[PDB]
Every structure is written in C-alpha cells, then in structure tokens.
C-alpha cells in the first residue's frame, strides 16, 4: 500500500525525513524537494574544506554490499547554495528502517 514517511519540522523553515542508502542502510535526513530532481548526501570522501560535512552524516560505500561504482562528477546549483561531488549507485530505503 501507500508508504508513510514522517517528517520533522524545524522552525516552520526546514522539513525533513529519514532515508537509508546501502545494505545495510546507512541513515540520512533529507529534504523531499519538489523543486529539484537529484538525490545526494555527504560522502565520507568529502574534502577537508567542506565544513558542512564535519557535522552531518556521511555515506561510506565500503560498508554497502549493494553499492555499484559510477564516479561521474556532478555540480548542482540551487537558489540557496551549491555543491559538487561524484555519482554512485545503491539501494535507497524510505523510511530508513
């Protein structure tokens, strides 16, 4: 049937829920964003310059049996903010558990 994904609300400004990436699933909080079409999360391979990465959850491909490498570089520009990295493939769980 339909799958409920409960969301948190921070200050009526950020709404986000938990998903899983990998086998077993590594949990991340994401904005389910109807104004964009890509999924991304921080990498364990993030640059030391990336302060945001220091205090968010990081995906480790080595710990996932379903990971399939891609490696193609990406850059995404939103109205508020930008990021870059590389692509990967894995199973995404909603909710995380």
């Amino acid at each position: 049937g339909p799958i409920p994904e409960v969301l948190k609300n921070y200050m009526d400004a950020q709404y986000y829920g938990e998903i899983g990436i990998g086998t077993p699933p590594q949990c991340f909080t994401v904005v389910f964003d109807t104004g964009s079409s890509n999924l991304w999360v921080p990498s364990i391979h993030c640059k030391l310059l990336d302060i945001a990465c220091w205090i968010h959850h990081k995906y480790n491909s080595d710990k996932s049996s379903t990971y399939v490498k891609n490696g193609t570089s990406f850059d995404i520009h939103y109205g508020s903010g930008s990021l870059s990295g590389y692509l990967s493939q894995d199973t995404v769980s909603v909710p995380c558990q």
């Binding site: 969301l7 200050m11 950020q14 964009s36 890509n38 990465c53 990021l83 199973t91």
Partner: protein
C-alpha cells in the same frame, strides 16, 4: 517501507558557502521531473514507478505550521492521507513538466492590491520555506501590508501588527486559496529575541525558466498538496487546522 534498487545519487564532496552548515538535514531528495535532473540522473520517484513499488504514481505532503507540533509533517508515497486534510481535492494541470509548474490566475491582497493581474506561471516547491514572487511585485505587496525590508528580498513585520493585516488570496484553477496573516507570517528566533518574518520573498528568476512565483511551505502548510505523475496534475485540499 520501500526499497528502490539501483538508484543513482550524488556523494557530495564540496559544499561552498554556509547554506548547508547549520541545516538540520544531511541531503536533498528531489521529486520534480527528469527534465531538470543534473546529469540526467533518473530520479528516485521515477525509479520507484519503473519498479512498480506503488499502485498509484502520486505522492502527498502534509506540513505542520506549528513549529513545535508532532509530527512535523508527512510525505505519503503512492497515496494521500485523510488524517491531514478536510474535504475534497481540487486539481490543476501541470503546464511545463520540469518543476511542478502550474498556472496562477492572480494574487490579491484583501485591501485591494492585485499582482499577477492577468495570470502567470508558478511552481509548487516543498523545498522552499517562503512564498516567492518577482522583486517589484513583492515590494508592492510588502508596502500594502506594512512590512519592511530585512536582507536579500526578505521582509519583517512588527509582531503586534500581524493580527490586523489583510488576508492574501491566490487564485488557482478559478478557485480562491486564502492565506490569513497567521498563515503567511512566520515566527523566527535568534539569541533569545522573537521577530515576525513576512512569508513572501522577492526574487527574480530569469528566462527561460522564469519569471516564476513559488508556492512554498507557507502555502503547502495551509493546503495539503498532492503531486500526481499519472495525470500530471497538482491537487490541493484544506489541511487539518
């Protein structure tokens, strides 16, 4: 739950500037059309559809507008959730299948100012907190309600003034969608102080995508929203209030 297999996604290694530093969330899961996917990566919901993991290819948002409420919201994949709306859904067709883009007939401040007077294009965007409109029209709007500029197209309103502001109504598919001052203003806190933010931000989106108004969390909070990929339409019902 659901397991979407073979999903392509970004492993972020650089995030310049400050926008992701203090964000509560780790990442973004985009749910618009494939047309605006960077690197043409097949989106999560598109993969979910291809893998037939739901029977109806629709998804729906409830967003609570009391910041301390539990639950904060719900995304329903493959259905709508009657717990969170009253009455029937009213639908509009998607115009441009890229964003969730629809025709906006007009925006009217109750005291008389009309924006988007002959109709315009808008998108329905869960990933922005505020309503967004053209800089010049939003400036007129903010003057009508007595808000004053803060920074980067945002405006604030004295909190003691909020309860006597005029309602603002967006006309979509020929129906009026009223926002009370309480709906279109947001409490913000920093360092033990409270202020009231105007829920409309001024921002000019250039052609070819723009100009565009954005129905953000301010709107979706009052009007439970259904995104329908089978019929390429958006549905609104009054949220639980």
């Amino acid at each position: 739950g659901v397991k979407v297999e073979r999903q392509v996604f970004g492993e972020a290694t650089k995030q310049p500037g400050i926008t992701f530093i203090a964000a509560k969330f780790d990442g973004i899961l985009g749910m618009a059309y494939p047309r605006i996917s960077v690197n043409n990566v097949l989106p999560v919901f598109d993969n979910l559809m291809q893998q037939k993991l739901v029977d109806q290819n629709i998804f729906s948002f409830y967003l609570s507008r009391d910041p301390d409420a539990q639950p904060g919201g719900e995304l329903m994949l493959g259905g709508t959730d009657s717990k969170y709306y009253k009455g029937s859904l009213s639908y509009l067709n998607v115009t441009r299948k890229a964003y969730w883009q629809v025709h906006l007939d007009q925006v009217e401040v109750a005291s008389g100012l009309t924006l988007c007077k002959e109709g315009c294009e808008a998108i329905v965007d869960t990933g922005t907190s505020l309503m967004v409109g053209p800089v010049d029209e939003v400036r007129e709007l903010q003057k009508a309600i007595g808000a004053v500029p803060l920074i980067q197209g945002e405006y604030m309103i004295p909190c003691e003034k909020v309860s006597t502001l005029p309602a603002i109504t967006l006309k979509l598919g020929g129906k009026g969608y009223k926002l009370s001052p309480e709906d279109y203003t947001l409490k913000v806190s920093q360092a033990g102080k409270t202020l009231c933010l105007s829920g409309f931000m001024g921002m000019d989106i250039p052609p070819p995508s723009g100009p565009l108004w954005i129905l953000g969390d301010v709107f979706i909070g009052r009007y439970y929203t259904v995104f329908d990929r089978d019929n390429n339409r958006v549905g609104f019902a009054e949220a639980a209030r």
